[PDB]
Design an enzyme around this catalytic site. Structure first.
Site, short mmCIF file in Angstrom:
data_model
loop_
_atom_site.label_atom_id
_atom_site.label_comp_id
_atom_site.label_asym_id
_atom_site.label_seq_id
_atom_site.Cartn_x
_atom_site.Cartn_y
_atom_site.Cartn_z
N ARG A 95 -6.57 11.20 -5.75
CA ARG A 95 -7.78 10.03 -5.51
C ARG A 95 -9.02 11.54 -5.76
O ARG A 95 -10.09 10.88 -5.95
CB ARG A 95 -7.51 9.75 -4.02
N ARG A 131 0.95 -1.33 -0.38
CA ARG A 131 0.25 -0.04 -0.63
C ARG A 131 0.74 1.65 0.31
O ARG A 131 0.63 2.03 0.08
CB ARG A 131 -0.75 0.20 0.91
N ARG A 189 -3.09 5.68 0.47
CA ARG A 189 -4.10 7.66 1.37
C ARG A 189 -3.29 8.02 2.63
O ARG A 189 -3.09 9.35 3.12
CB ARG A 189 -5.62 7.06 2.05
N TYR A 238 -14.66 -13.40 -0.58
CA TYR A 238 -15.66 -11.63 -0.77
C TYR A 238 -16.80 -11.72 -1.88
O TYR A 238 -18.39 -11.65 -1.47
CB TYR A 238 -14.59 -11.13 -1.91
N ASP A 268 -7.62 -2.42 -7.34
CA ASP A 268 -8.41 -3.47 -7.08
C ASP A 268 -8.11 -4.66 -6.78
O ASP A 268 -8.45 -5.46 -7.74
CB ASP A 268 -9.93 -3.15 -7.39
#
Ligand SMILES: [Cl-]
Ligand SMILES: [Cl-]
Lengths: 347, 355
Positions: free
Chosen positions: B40, B27, B31, B155, B78
């Site tokens: 973003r 990551r 963010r 998922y 993703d």
């Protein structure tokens, strides 16, 4: 005057006829009679602080499930921080954040400050009338410390671990006072009639291998060194359970406790190979299995029994507490399976 | 053989001599970087960012420009790409997280699922790989990635994020025939997806088995690792004149390293619960190791970050075969300067363990 004591015998490596079973959170919301008593109490703290009600829910799974081989004291892991004056309501009105905070913390007196727990133990022990052994318990110092530093339930323990890496000196101070508190708390329960004790190190599994040794296990060792090891003419077995702690069994096995709890991620056959000569093992079924059909539940019990193999030294349990949506009949099929299928592995 | 200016990441994975221990961070585009958050915002949301190759490239390169120590880029994308391409209707519930409109619950549901073709059906991902590969201009290797079949399956059966995985595991125990059908199809899909990424320019690939660690030891073998093994056997092993190293990462899988090491992948990822010295003793002859620092350490002061880096380097010990990383992704509230101290500590302090 114990009538059924196979649970204690398995923990002490004595011969048994079948593998004993009990279940974490066997008193809980999956039982309609628990929900009734909880509603009767009015709130969760009332249930905990009323020895008659704590006893009532403690006995309920035993009366429903004759296969269960142990009772566990119904209480809250957070009694001790609450007693320290932190104001438990799952959060705390007062939150630990400075060294000054920790130094001011009192070490609760078991009978003077936690008398309702001691009363619950005496009441339960009497009402059991020797039907099965009584397990007393407490959270670990590391686990209690995180609750006190997070101020309650936590996202990812950032604050607790940051404080660990930034001010290990303060964290040592807190952990040491909690070790002191847990030791006398468990000794209180033992004096009151507990016949085994379990230390729940629920959040120890989030620590690095190194941090676990220094900030959780070392303090459980301190506790075990201070525990009453014999009461009522019997040994009082100690069970250490760090969920997610399977990597660390070898060091856990050298602390001097009788048994280690396991969760499902650790193969129990491998665990027996690694530390079986030093400790009994408790566990380890994935609670999610109880949501499957009875045939699948039986199959999973059989697999685990086969993995452990022949001889004493195993107490069957889940690797975590049961959840509120489980069918009580599926829980029963689990307990029955353990007694029915384990017989072949003894003698 | 196409040009790289820095390839110590690849060399460590292949147990070749390196000057310092390579480092990258899960990551590392995310963010915690204010430049990421700006990009973003310009895209509108995460999904739009993933589906715009130019912007996916932009954020992929940001941590590299900020942090010269980083030794690898990872494809910004993703984890839920494949089940979306399968038609399950990925969207984002305002207050929760990613969800699918369609949920897998039966064998018939599973049989109907198509296997996406990477270039034909996930062209926006393959374009991102090509674009990043070109814009990197050989500064560092590019890592492609995918979720594992078990992780993707969860998922699709849960229909989004889950805490306890009760529905996935219920299906595992109650309907293993269907659950295996799903896992099989997902392994085929992940294999062609990763191979498409390699052909498009990925120079290493990582399989993220994020939820494999919730399985029992026995279930892990049958319902997760067996399917990562299928994938590894089907991967392109060499491209652009180089071996393409494979990293298998099951978070919380430290008990199972021995079996993971028998699969044939070059490297295994570790989290902080596993002592990396112990890991090296257990499987270090068979695999390189990636990890393993607790992301929470990055909230501590830089002196503590350096000390923890030092501890982990000392535990791995001397010689190649280690890529430094976290055991988990960085979180948004970590100060960029703390991440910087981390990368600088790895390069500075690891030199003494090489040569
Ligand atoms: Cl097992
Ligand atoms: Cl380590």
């Amino acid at each position: 005057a114990l009538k059924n004591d196979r649970f204690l015998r398995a923990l002490l490596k004595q011969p048994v006829d079948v593998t004993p079973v009990w279940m974490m959170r066997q008193a809980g919301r999956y039982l309609p009679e628990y929900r009734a008593t909880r509603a009767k109490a009015g709130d969760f703290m009332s249930l905990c602080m009323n020895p008659e009600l704590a006893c009532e829910v403690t006995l309920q799974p035993l009366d429903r499930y004759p296969q269960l081989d142990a009772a566990i004291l119904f209480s809250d892991i957070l009694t001790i921080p609450d007693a320290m004056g932190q104001g438990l309501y799952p959060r705390f009105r007062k939150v630990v954040s400075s060294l000054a905070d920790i130094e001011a913390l009192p070490v609760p007196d078991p009978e003077q400050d936690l008398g309702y727990v001691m009363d619950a133990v005496r009441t339960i022990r009497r009402e059991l009338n020797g039907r099965v052994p009584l397990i007393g318990f407490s959270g670990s110092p590391w686990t209690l410390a995180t609750y006190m530093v997070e101020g309650g339930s936590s996202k990812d323990f950032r604050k607790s671990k940051a404080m660990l890496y930034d001010n290990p000196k303060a964290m040592h101070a807190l952990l040491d006072k909690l070790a002191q508190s847990v030791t006398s708390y468990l000794n209180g329960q033992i004096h009151a009639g507990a016949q085994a004790v379990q230390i729940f190190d629920s959040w120890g599994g989030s620590l690095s291998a190194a941090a676990y040794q220094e900030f959780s296990l070392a303090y459980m060792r301190k506790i075990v060194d201070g525990l009453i090891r014999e009461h009522d003419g019997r040994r009082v077995p100690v069970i250490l359970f760090t969920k997610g702690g399977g990597l660390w069994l070898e060091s856990m096995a050298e602390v001097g406790a009788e048994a280690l709890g396991l969760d499902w991620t650790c193969d129990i056959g491998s665990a027996r190979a690694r530390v079986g000569e030093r400790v009994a093992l408790q566990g380890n079924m994935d609670p999610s299995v109880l949501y499957a059909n009875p045939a699948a539940i039986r199959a999973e019990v059989a697999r685990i029994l086969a993995a452990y193999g022949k001889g004493t030294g195993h107490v069957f349990n889940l690797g975590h507490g049961i959840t509120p949506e489980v069918d009580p009949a599926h829980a029963g099929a689990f307990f029955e399976a353990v007694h029915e299928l384990s017989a072949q592995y003894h003698g």
